[PDB]
Amino acid sequence: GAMAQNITARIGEPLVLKCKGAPKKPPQRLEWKLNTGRTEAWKVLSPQGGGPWDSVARVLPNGSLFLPAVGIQDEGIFRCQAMNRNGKETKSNYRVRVYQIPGKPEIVDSASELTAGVPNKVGTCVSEGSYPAGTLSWHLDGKPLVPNEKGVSVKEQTRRHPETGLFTLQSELMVTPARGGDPRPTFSCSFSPGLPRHRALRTAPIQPRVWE
Numbered sequence: 001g002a003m004a005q006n007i008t009a010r011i012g013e014p015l016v017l018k019c020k021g022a023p024k025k026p027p028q029r030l031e032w033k034l035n036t037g038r039t040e041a042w043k044v045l046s047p048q049g050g051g052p053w054d055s056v057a058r059v060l061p062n063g064s065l066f067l068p069a070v071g072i073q074d075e076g077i078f079r080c081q082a083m084n085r086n087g088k089e090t091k092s093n094y095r096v097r098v099y100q101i102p103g104k105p106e107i108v109d110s111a112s113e114l115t116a117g118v119p120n121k122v123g124t125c126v127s128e129g130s131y132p133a134g135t136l137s138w139h140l141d142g143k144p145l146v147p148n149e150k151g152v153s154v155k156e157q158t159r160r161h162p163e164t165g166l167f168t169l170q171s172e173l174m175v176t177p178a179r180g181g182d183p184r185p186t187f188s189c190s191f192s193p194g195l196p197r198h199r200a201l202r203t204a205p206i207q208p209r210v211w212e
């Protein structure tokens with residue numbers, strides 16, 4: 001695609017996109033073009049508006065495009081093209097990615113006793129309401145726990161809310177505790193949005209007893 005400004009918009013929240021180089025108020029020679037999950041390729045929106053699109057994306061008096069409540073299907077590309085009073089042409093190019101923050105992750109079905117030297121189901125971490133899916137991961141004593149090594153295995157599951165499209169993630173941790181290890185280890189789970197600069201959410205720890 002072309003060079004664009006990256007926009008991350010939260011689902012359910014309004015979004016205002018500026019049309020650079022447009023006069024402050026009508027009359028304005030400007031045109032918005034968008035290609036999203038709602039469109040068949042490009043769709044043109046004008047200052048006068050009209051039709052079903054007014055509910056979704058509307059041109060404001062200053063020429064900005066306004067979406068009162070962003071949804072998943074609004075992901076895509078938004079372009080404005082405008083001329084000023086001087087006849088100079090100015091283009092605005094936005095890449096819009098949408099997201100939603102899940103609620104705090106939780107550990108369910110956690111074991112209270114582990115036996116060293118054999119595999120143990122430690123617990124199940126669940127995260128509800130994310131977009132995009134993101135990922136779950138486990139930590140032991142404040143350090144990342146890598147699957148498939150050191151007797152550690154993880155199984156993962158992703159489900160989608162039938163109406164909202166938001167993801168629910170589930171992760172089951174199994175460990176084989178080494179002999180002569182910590183009798184009271186501390187495990188925790190965290191959610192990573194994956195989306196740049198978004199912060200992780202962390203579960204409350206679980207502290208099972210380990211039998212030698």
Ligand code: NA
Pocket residue numbers: 001002003004077093095
């Ligand atoms: Na583009």
